[PDB]
Amino acid sequence: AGSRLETVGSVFSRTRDLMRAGVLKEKPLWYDIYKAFPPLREPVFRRPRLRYGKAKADIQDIFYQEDQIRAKFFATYGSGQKAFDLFNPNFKSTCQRFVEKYTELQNLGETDEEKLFVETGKALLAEGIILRRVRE
Amino acid sequence: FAEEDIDRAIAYLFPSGLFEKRARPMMKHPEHIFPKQRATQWGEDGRPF
Amino acid sequence: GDDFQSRILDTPLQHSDFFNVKELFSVKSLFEARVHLGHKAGCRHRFMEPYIFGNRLGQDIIDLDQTALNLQLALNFTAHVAYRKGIILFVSRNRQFSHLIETTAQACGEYAHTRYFKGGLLTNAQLLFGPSVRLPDLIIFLHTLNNVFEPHVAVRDAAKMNIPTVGIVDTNCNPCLITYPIPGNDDSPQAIQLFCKLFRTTINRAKEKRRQMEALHRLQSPK
Amino acid sequence: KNRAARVRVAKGNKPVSYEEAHAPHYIAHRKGWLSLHTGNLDGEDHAAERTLEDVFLRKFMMGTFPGCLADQIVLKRRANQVDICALVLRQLPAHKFYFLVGYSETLLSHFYKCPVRLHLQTVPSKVVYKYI
RNA sequence: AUAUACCGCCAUCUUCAGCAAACCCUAAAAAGGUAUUAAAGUAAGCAAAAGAAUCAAACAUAAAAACGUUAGGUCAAGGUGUAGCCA
Ligand SMILES: [K+]
Ligand SMILES: [Mg+2]
Ligand SMILES: [Mg+2]
Ligand SMILES: [Mg+2]
Ligand SMILES: [Mg+2]
Ligand SMILES: [Mg+2]
Ligand SMILES: [Mg+2]
């Protein structure tokens, strides 16, 4: 005898209730553990519903300030001819070096975006990076 | 005394002329007559093996 | 005598982290294993939005700060269950990780069911396994979906039998019936490999801790 | 359909014995003969008389041990000796069986003019081959 | 007298492939319950199959063939319910 009603309450609440009624005479071994270290949320059934009208989710689009610079670099030079290595946790791509230098110049106090874009290209050219201004 | 000697002795002491040999008297080792593995698949605690 | 049995079973519940599961993992360790990568925004379940840090260009990102809190609770619960000699069943239907999960269960000393799940396995267990079959005391769902992108039957059936479930839930999953949800990536081999390692070390520690606790208390009885 | 000596299927709750379970075509294959005499062998006489004695001996044993027979009796004739082998339930007291054996033996030995012996194997209850 | 009260023993579809019961599941069920790179069905029966018979072996032939259908046949094989006869 049990409560195979998984849409009312939770495994813990149904086990608590069954013992109060007098049907379950021995506590499950997982019961005392749940009482002492419960989950953050109670595991109760809820019917997923759809959103209607003007209800919307609340998920923040992840856009950092570097993305403004990165977008320009991809539009002007595309992706660096060197291939991304996403297995190296500290990989520095050609675009990420462009954004690191672009930031340094902006710290000096340059206020014109055009100035920061052409100066960074010159600095990387001195470094020896091959930047191709591919309109294609 | 062997399994062959057993089967021969049982045939002499309990002569049966039934055509189907599954229906004749048999004194075989329990491993044969019973299914090989009908044993419990868990112990006293109830934890499967 | 009675005090010793009470000491073995009642003392562990007086400490917040009796098995010190906190050290096994860290937010950085989870980030290396790509545990923060979720499905596209279209595949998102409504009950997962609490756990999602945001949407990075169409790909939902899973907050690894909530994952650490939830994973801590799930690992602690899995340890106390293993400490008390409960049966733990690993369940998944992802065929890429079928052999890995069966190897993990065998290493832990527990059970795995990575194959087609028969209707009634838990709600009609006596007919299938025998009159006195003992059902699992905890089910760990490394994957909570079957191969037709529907909830694994054992999620609902484990709630019907009042079995607690520790499940890995991704952005497209429904965590409502999972007792201890662990928000995280379930598709990447590096994410699944990390979770399998954590569950196996945690279970082995709790089993070892029980052996040591029994010897100390047992030795005191003559001594 | 054939209706001869076939204990037909019920709903899984009817306890049939080994003898009842098997239809006539299993005679000499899975189940033997309840009576063994030499009167149906080739070039042998008195089949009619041996068969009539068997019919009576079965009706006599049923009435003499009413409700105490677990299965059909087995009749074995050797020379002029007749031997009746019956499975009997343990319902009656032990001393009553000694009375019915002494009575049924003497009565059938003076009726057919042969030495007749009764062999009784007592069972705790009817043996069930299968539930049909 | 009644096979239109039955037992017993059969015909017919028929060497056709089905009949019946215990459990489990459903945002209720009037019903349904399959997916094998598997999605709720499971585990036992009866028939088929297998086995046995035609005295090597096969094939073939016999035998076997459930639940139902035809108030099918048989009160005259025997037994028997109900009604009827007893100078
Ligand atoms: K009839
Ligand atoms: Mg996934
Ligand atoms: Mg008729
Ligand atoms: Mg007529
Ligand atoms: Mg043959
Ligand atoms: Mg056949
Ligand atoms: Mg008619």
UniProtKB/Swiss-Prot annotation, chain A:
Location in or out of the cell: Mitochondrion
Modified residues (N6-succinyllysine): 82
Residue numbers of N-acetylalanine PTMs: 1
Coiled coil location: none
Any one GO CC term of the record: nuclear membrane
A Gene Ontology molecular function term of the record: structural constituent of ribosome
Keyword terms, alphabetized: Acetylation, Mitochondrion, Ribonucleoprotein, Ribosomal protein
Domain of life: Eukaryota
Assigned protein family: Belongs to the mitochondrion-specific ribosomal protein mS23 family.
Subunit annotation: Component of the mitochondrial ribosome small subunit (28S) which comprises a 12S rRNA and about 30 distinct proteins.
Protein name (database record): Small ribosomal subunit protein mS23
Organism per entry: Mus musculus
From Swiss-Prot, chain B:
Subcellular location: Mitochondrion
Subunit: Component of the mitochondrial ribosome small subunit (28S) which comprises a 12S rRNA and about 30 distinct proteins.
Family according to the record: Belongs to the universal ribosomal protein uS9 family.
Protein name: Small ribosomal subunit protein uS9m
Organism, scientific name: Mus musculus
Lineage: Eukaryota, Metazoa, Chordata, Craniata, Vertebrata
UniProtKB/Swiss-Prot annotation, chain C:
Keywords: Mitochondrion, Ribonucleoprotein, Ribosomal protein
Keyword Repeat: no
Single GO cellular component term: mitochondrial small ribosomal subunit
Subcellular localization(s) per the UniProt record: Mitochondrion
Keyword Ligase: no
Domain of life per record: Eukaryota
One of the GO biological process terms: mitochondrial translation
GO MF, any single term: structural constituent of ribosome
Record's subunit section: Component of the mitochondrial ribosome small subunit (28S) which comprises a 12S rRNA and about 30 distinct proteins.
Family: Belongs to the universal ribosomal protein uS2 family.
Its job: Required for mitoribosome formation and stability, and mitochondrial translation.
Protein name: Small ribosomal subunit protein uS2m
Classification lineage: Eukaryota, Metazoa, Chordata, Craniata, Vertebrata
Residues of the full protein shown: 52 to 274 of 291
From Swiss-Prot, chain D:
Compartment(s): Mitochondrion
Subunit record text: Component of the mitochondrial ribosome small subunit (28S) which comprises a 12S rRNA and about 30 distinct proteins.
Principal location listed in the UniProt entry: mitochondrion
Keywords, in A-Z order: Mitochondrion, Ribonucleoprotein, Ribosomal protein, Transit peptide
Gene Ontology MF terms: structural constituent of ribosome
Species this chain originates from: Mus musculus (Mouse)
Keyword Cytoplasm among record annotations: no
Family that this chain belongs to: Belongs to the universal ribosomal protein uS3 family.
Signal peptide (residue range): none
GO CC terms in record: mitochondrial inner membrane; mitochondrial small ribosomal subunit; mitochondrion
GO-annotated biological processes: mitochondrial translation
Organism domain of life: Eukaryota
Name of this chain's protein: Small ribosomal subunit protein uS3m
